[PDB]
Each structure stands twice: as C-alpha cells, then as structure tokens.
From a paper:
The G protein‐coupled adenosine [name] receptor (A2AAR) is an important new (potential) drug target in immuno‐oncology, and for neurodegenerative diseases. It couples to Gs proteins leading to an increase in intracellular cyclic adenosine monophosphate (cAMP) concentrations. In an effort to strongly reduce the number of point mutations and, in particular, to avoid mutations located in the orthosteric ligand binding pocket, we developed a new, significantly improved thermostabilized A2AAR mutant harboring only a single point mutation (designated [name]‐[name]‐[name]) and yet endowed with superior stability compared to the [name]‐StaR2 mutant.
In fact, the highest A2AAR affinity was achieved with the shortest PEG linker comprised of four ethyleneglycol units (compound 4, [name]‐2113, K i 2.28 nM). Despite the sterically more demanding tricyclic core, the Preladenant derivative [name]‐2113 binds to the A2AAR in the same orientation as ZM241385 and shows similar direct ligand interactions to helices V, VI, VII and extracellular loop (ECL) 2. In addition, the tricyclic aromatic system is stabilized by π–π stacking to F168ECL2 and by hydrophobic contacts to L2496.51 and I2747.39. However, the tricyclic core of [name]‐2113 extends further towards helix II which leads to the displacement of one of the structural water molecules from the ligand binding pocket. Hence, the displacement of the water molecule by [name]‐2113 from the ligand binding pocket would be expected to be energetically favorable and is likely one of the reasons for the compound's high affinity. The phenylpiperazinylethyl moiety that is attached to the N7 in [name]‐2113 extends towards the extracellular surface of the A2AAR, stabilized by π–π stacking to H264ECL3. This indicates that the PEG‐chain located at the receptor surface is highly flexible, which is a desired characteristic for the intended purpose to attach variable reporter molecules to the terminus of the linker.
Numbering used by the authors: -2 to 208, 1001 to 1042, 1057 to 1106, 219 to 305
Write the structure that this text describes.
Amino acid sequence: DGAPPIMGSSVYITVELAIAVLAILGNVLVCWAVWLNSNLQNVTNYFVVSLAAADIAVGVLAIPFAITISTGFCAACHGCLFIACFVLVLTQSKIFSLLAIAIDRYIAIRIPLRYNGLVTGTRAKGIIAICWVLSFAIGLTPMLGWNNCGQPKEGKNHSQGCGEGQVACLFEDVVPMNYMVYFNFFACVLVPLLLMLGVYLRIFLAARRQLADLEDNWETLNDNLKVIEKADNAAQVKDALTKMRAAALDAQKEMKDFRHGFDILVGQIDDALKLANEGKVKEAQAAAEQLKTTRNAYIQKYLERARSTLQKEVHAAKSLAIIVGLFALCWLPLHIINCFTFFCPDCSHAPLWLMYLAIVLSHTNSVVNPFIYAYRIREFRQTFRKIIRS
Ligand SMILES: CC(C)CCC[C@@H](C)[C@H]1CC[C@H]2[C@@H]3CC=C4C[C@@H](O)CC[C@]4(C)[C@H]3CC[C@]12C
Ligand SMILES: CC(C)CCC[C@@H](C)[C@H]1CC[C@H]2[C@@H]3CC=C4C[C@@H](O)CC[C@]4(C)[C@H]3CC[C@]12C
Ligand SMILES: CC(C)CCC[C@@H](C)[C@H]1CC[C@H]2[C@@H]3CC=C4C[C@@H](O)CC[C@]4(C)[C@H]3CC[C@]12C
Ligand SMILES: CCCCCCCC/C=C/CCCCCCCC(=O)OC[C@H](O)CO
Ligand SMILES: CCCCCCCC/C=C\CCCCCCCC(=O)O
Ligand SMILES: CCCCCCCC/C=C\CCCCCCCC(=O)O
Ligand SMILES: CCCCCCCC/C=C\CCCCCCCC(=O)O
C-alpha cells in the first residue's frame, strides 16, 4: 500500500545526476584554472587540485555507484562492498587534502622565511600520492574482512532471488555500522576535522599576535621619541635610545630598500647614542629628531606592507576555513544519522526520505568548492572569467 518505489527513485536518481554534472563541470574548471595561471601554481593549490580531482571522481563514479546501490540489486558481496565504500575513499582523500592545506598555511604564517625551503612542490606531490594510498586502504577496509558478508539477510536475498554468494546490495546490510561510526566517523573524519579547527585557530592566533607586535614596535618608536624631546638628563635620552635600538633591530628581524631604511634608522640612533653618552643633551635631541624623516619615508612603508601581507593571510585562511566548515555541514548529518542507528536501537530508524536527503546533501559538497574560490579568491575568479569568456 506504499507508493511505487520507481517514483521516489526517479526523483533521487534525477537529483543525483544533476549533482554529478555540476560537480564535474565546476571542479574541471578549477583544474583548468590552475593549469593555465602560474599565479595559481603554488603548493597550496596542489592540494586544491587533489581536492578537485576527488570531487570530479564523485560525479563520475561515486554518484553512479550510489544510484546503483539504491536499487538493491543482487550482487557478489565484495563487489557490492566496493560500490558502497568507494565514496569513503574519495572523502578520505579530501580530508587529507583539507588537513594539509591548513598545515601548509600554518607553516606559511609561523615561519615564512623557511616556507619555500620546507614546503616544496616535489614534497607536496609525494604527500598527495601517499594520502591517496591511505585513503584507499581506509575507505576499503570493509573489503579486508570487516563486513556483514558472512551474515547475509537470507530473507531479502531469497525474495529478490539472488544467486549463490550474492546478496541484495544494500549499504546498511553489507557495511558494518560500527565501522561507520567508530572507524570512519570518529577516527577518520571527526578527529581530523577537530585538528583542522585547532590549526586554523593557531593560524588566527599567530596573525593576531604578529599584528599586535608590529603596532607595539611602531608605538615604541613614536613614544620614545617624545621621551627624548622632553628629557632633561642625558641618561633619559640614553635609556630611551637604547629601547629604540632594540625595537628597531627587532622590527627587521626592493627588499634592500627596506633594509636600507633600517640601516639609516639604526645609524641615526647610534649617532644620537654617541652624543648622549658624551653628555650633549641638546645635540642628542636634535639628532633623534632626524629619525622622523626616516620613519616617514621608510619605516611607515614597511609597517603598512607587513600589515597588508598579514591581513591577506587572515582573509585567505578564512576562505579555506569556510571550505572545511561546508564539508562538515554536508557530511555531519549522514554521520549523525548513523550514530542514531547504531547507538539507539530503540529509536525508530530515520525514514527513507531523510536518509536520501542526507546522502544527496553529502554529494552537494562536490559542487560548493569552485563557488568558494570564485567568490573569495580573486586569482581564481579572474582566471574563471578568462576561461569562460574565451
Ligand atoms: C576507470 C573506471 C571508469 C572503471 C570503472 C570500474 C567499475 C565501473 C567496475 C569495477 C569493479 C566492478 C564491480 C566488480 C564486482 C561486480 C560484482 C557483480 O555482482 C556486480 C557488479 C560489480 C559490483 C562490478 C560493478 C562495476 C565495477 C565496480
Ligand atoms: C550538523 C548540523 C547540520 C545539524 C544536524 C541535524 C540532524 C543531523 C539531526 C537533528 C535531529 C535528528 C533527528 C531527531 C529525531 C531522530 C529520530 C530517530 O528515530 C532517528 C534519528 C532522528 C531522525 C534524528 C536524525 C538526525 C537528526 C535529523
Ligand atoms: C561535530 C560535533 C558537533 C560532534 C559530533 C556530534 C555527535 C558526536 C553527537 C551529537 C548528538 C549525539 C547523539 C544525541 C542523541 C543520542 C541518543 C542516544 O540514544 C544515543 C547517542 C545519541 C545518538 C548521540 C550520539 C552522538 C551524537 C550524534
Ligand atoms: C588499512 C587501513 C589502515 C592502514 C593505515 C596504516 C598503515 C601503516 C603505514 C603505512 C605506510 C604508508 C604507505 C603509503 C605509501 C605508498 C608509497 C608511495 O607512493 O610513496 C611515494 C613517496 O613519495 C616516496 O616513496
Ligand atoms: C563521464 C561518465 C560518467 C558516468 C557515465 C555513466 C552514467 C550512468 C549513471 C548511472 C547508471 C547506474 C545503473 C543502475 C544499475 C541498476 C541495477 C539493476 O539493473 O538492477
Ligand atoms: C604517518 C606519520 C604522520 C606524521 C607526519 C605527518 C605530519 C602531520 C600529519 C597530521 C597529524 C595532525 C597534525 C596536527 C597539527 C600539526 C601542525 C603543527 O603542529 O605544526
Ligand atoms: C602526483 C600524485 C598523483 C596521485 C595519483 C593517485 C594514486 C592512487 C593510486 C592507487 C592506490 C590504490 C592502492 C591501495 C591498495 C589498498 C586498497 C585495498 O585493496 O584494500
């Protein structure tokens, strides 16, 4: 007395095909953009490309697999396992790519001087290839023996008339829910997501601390100038100049144009320090006044450029954090439903329509990343226009 299953099946299959088309087109555009623009050919975008390659595979393979397993067709149980678990391989690869992007950005903001020598393209390719191997091993673990193939639903397999060694290919009949909850969700998805949260929190903490240190050195420069102009004793000028020389060397610790600026600044401070040690107070004050011209024509240019670079790193890290957040938004509902199915056997199973709504939502994650790049990364957006208009 239920509606014919092909009616709801047609809606589900049509929606899945719409998602596969959008996932392929958008992520092919991302890969094409990185190929054409050398400004997008950095190590960070090598993981973005691996991220896009997995989403392309979601539309090409994982979504046709999901359509197949929804029919419950008779199949050899290990072949049904591969059909059911291959999306876990792709998803695990994206988790590894997302974690590497956060680590790459944390390295770029914590030690930017050592970044290009530490994070190279060759090492990135090796990391990516290793993570794909681990993704296959993690996602296909049920094929190694952790499955319900040894406990088949004989009622379903007889009613559908499956042959010997065959089962009705249904996800929750062949894939153990304890694998899905403890192994896949808790260990392989939830824990890495929490690690990404901690890395991005450390990224924003590092940026906030460095931006405050730039303003601290800047105000230390201007406040000690007022101390010298209103000083009366020679030691007052000397103590204020010693603290400027520390804040000057600690601020540097066309790139030589900024190095030449601190050379003038420290040189003038040493000039005023020599006069202050001699007892000359008026001549030491006038020498310290020369620091203002160096501050305007040099030191202020470094502050605003160093501040601009840090603000770009904050904005870029926020964009990459949105991608992690949308990943969790798309996949957590399916994981949470499996937790209810596993941990509350007295709860009624989530209805059929909610199951496939959660499945469809997890697939839409393969569509959203190209939109994040187009809206939040100007280099991607301008390359997208160039590809499309020509
Ligand atoms: C390079 C790409 C495009 C190749 C695609 C490979 C896919 C389409 C192939 C490889 C292994 C194949 C599975 C191997 C096991 C059999 C078991 C059988 O009872 C039903 C079909 C099933 C489940 C096959 C489904 C399709 C399958 C998953
Ligand atoms: C992570 C963000 C998007 C929030 C996730 C909300 C979803 C995953 C939660 C909120 C309410 C939850 C439902 C509340 C009612 C129960 C009834 C029980 O018999 C089956 C599970 C079911 C149906 C839960 C399924 C998962 C659920 C729908
Ligand atoms: C990403 C953050 C939010 C952590 C992930 C949320 C998960 C771990 C939490 C949120 C809601 C929790 C569920 C809330 C309802 C209870 C019902 C109980 O009978 C079994 C445990 C169960 C089903 C919990 C299982 C674990 C659970 C699904
Ligand atoms: C089975 C599911 C869980 C398994 C998880 C525990 C496995 C233990 C450690 C494995 C080492 C990593 C193996 C992957 C490396 C593949 C080789 C490769 O390609 O490495 C190229 C590298 O750039 C230069 O060799
Ligand atoms: C670029 C290629 C992308 C994939 C092309 C193939 C498109 C076909 C999509 C899914 C087909 C699913 C077949 C359904 C299996 C039905 C099982 C049964 O007969 O009982
Ligand atoms: C198989 C060996 C794994 C260790 C090498 C891989 C490097 C770390 C990989 C991910 C672990 C989680 C990292 C958590 C934050 C690390 C960033 C940091 O502390 O600087
Ligand atoms: C530049 C780097 C490009 C990386 C391409 C991706 C390579 C992925 C290769 C296939 C790994 C499959 C082998 C895993 C075996 C264990 C899975 C299993 O059979 O259980």
